[PDB]
Design a protein around this ligand. Structure first.
Ligand SMILES: [Cl-]
Lengths: 342, 342
């Protein structure tokens, strides 16, 4: 019987999941807000032996682990990144003999979310809905002199060009949606992405430059690492059409710092839809939130009922499996060794 | 050279269209708001000989035409309905010698808008967007105590049931989007609609009861006529699951008056997304508009760039064509016979 904490559950959804009953033999506290800074966070989880993390919402540093003597298990919803950086210091965990348990993820919820944003942006749904609530009939704004003529009006997807930057599992689903809407789908990425795209019957853009020039909607599906940090520059974005939509439900740092705000202010692309920010949560506003030609959602790509059932079901079962000596989900198995060999 | 007026163009889009230059030899006035008063409407359009209407935005009554001696042409964007309802009194037009020109429609823009609402509603996009703008991180604000658990978080489409009521051109497209997202499509309608659906590979409902009970998302795709008017009752809607979404982008009058409000207030369906209203424009104090579980858009289904280019292109060409004697677009051909014979 462990003291378990689940962090960063803003809408208090975790405790209402069918899978929550998996932890019936344990004492579970779910927190509904985020605390940053080592001191306050260590005091909040001082007695917990098992910590459940929601994706990358909280980072686990050596300095945090120094302040947590009772911690035995970190159970990660979704994948644990082995690369430099990563939101969990695995070596520091291994040093304390804290096991990190790895879950599994799914591309479906964030792919559908990507498309929901494509459709919402191209039809100016948030803008029209908000205007209507304030009494303005059929008004979406977007009528500035710097903007294209009739930019406030909806745009059809059929027969337009969809650029897909990155062809992993999410990119592949979203490319499929494009095809089913009758869009002209072009893919770009590393060599193996191009190969899998060609095998799937998708056209590959001539170059990265060609992707940004030609796309009416450009959507980014890349994992963040040293190769892809700042891979999208202001030069790339300002190559985009004045009527073009830039979509990013991946990671904010894929675009060079302030690059997006900068490009929107220069009028190319014409619109953006984003789900991810450099700093989260955003409680005190953001430049992009005050722009009528940006639609921003609060990192809801994976916030979905079936996704939570699967994600937490696995993270909770992982804790149960470890307590029975099944250590298959351990990311850092050398933390199981005695302190003498550690 | 005729005096032409275009009515009800709220965002002043018509004059910025490429097809607007078809009327370069004429005097065009475009109005940007709606007057319904027969006296105020007559005074606006007192000197014009050609009237271009935007779908059903303005009603043309006998008592309107009586107050308009100079009017010769009514050019309709989209189709002209010969139904007992009908927003134009075609008989009055004939009696006054006014020719009514019928245009052509397209299912693409309203089908894509339907899907945009399905996705916006299922991921609670406007709710999350508006909350974020107000400083609430990852709150959809669906704060009812009688809603299903976790109803404030998003829901994937994959694996869910898509109910389609009516299988014309728009329903066929929406069914195709359902299939593309991995939904189980369920089609209901008249025999020939059900037959076309089975041939297209879709499951069909055995009864209207089955359609309302089994759908997770239910979308209505019927034309309004003597049989489909008030075809959806409160009793239909309260057969829907408390987790279900009802979508209506077709016509408000398919649903019995106050039926949707009543049903939503009784928790069944759990949510609605509605593009069409009994009286348009609506007022800010409209009942549905106040509801957190109703996403309301201001009849934007056909308000789209390519759609406007197509619809107005045809309507403007129709005017040009009848001025040169080509009268194929005339819906009331007997209006062309001499006043003494009328
Ligand atoms: Cl319309």
């Amino acid at each position: 019987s462990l003291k378990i904490a689940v962090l960063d559950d803003y809408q208090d959804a975790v405790r209402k999941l069918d899978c929550f009953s998996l932890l019936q033999d344990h004492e579970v506290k779910v927190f509904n807000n985020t605390v940053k800074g080592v001191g306050q966070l260590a005091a909040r989880v001082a007695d917990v032996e098992a910590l459940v993390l929601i994706r990358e919402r909280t980072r686990v540093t050596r300095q945090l682990l120094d302040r947590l003597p009772k911690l035995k298990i970190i159970s990660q919803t979704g994948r644990v990144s082995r690369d430099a950086g990563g939101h969990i210091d695995l070596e520091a965990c291994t040093d304390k003999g804290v096991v990190v348990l790895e879950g599994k993820g799914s591309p479906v919820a964030p792919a559908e979310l990507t498309w929901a944003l494509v459709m919402a942006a191209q039809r100016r749904i948030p803008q029209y809905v908000a205007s209507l609530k304030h009494g303005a009939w059929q008004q979406s704004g977007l009528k500035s002199t710097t903007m294209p003529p009739n930019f406030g009006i909806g745009r059809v997807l059929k027969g337009q060009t969809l650029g897909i930057f990155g062809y992993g599992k999410i990119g592949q689903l979203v490319a499929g949606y494009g095809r089913a809407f009758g869009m002209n789908v072009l893919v770009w990425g590393r060599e193996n992405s191009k190969e899998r795209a060609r095998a799937d019957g998708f056209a590959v853009a001539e170059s990265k430059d060609a992707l940004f020039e030609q796309s009416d909607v450009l959507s980014v599906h890349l994992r963040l690492n040293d190769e892809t940090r700042s891979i999208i520059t202001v030069a790339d974005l300002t190559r985009m059409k004045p009527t073009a939509l830039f979509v990013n439900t991946s990671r904010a740092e894929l675009v060079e710092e302030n690059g997006m705000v900068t490009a929107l202010n220069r009028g190319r692309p014409g619109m953006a839809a984003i789900d991810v920010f450099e700093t989260e949560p955003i409680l005190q506003g953001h430049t992009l939130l005050r722009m009528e030609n940006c639609i921003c959602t609060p990192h809801i790509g994976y916030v979905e009922r079936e996704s939570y059932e699967m994600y937490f079901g696995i993270a909770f079962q992982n804790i149960l499996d470890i307590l029975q000596g099944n250590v298959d989900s351990v990311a850092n198995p050398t933390a199981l060794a005695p302190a003498l060999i550690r």
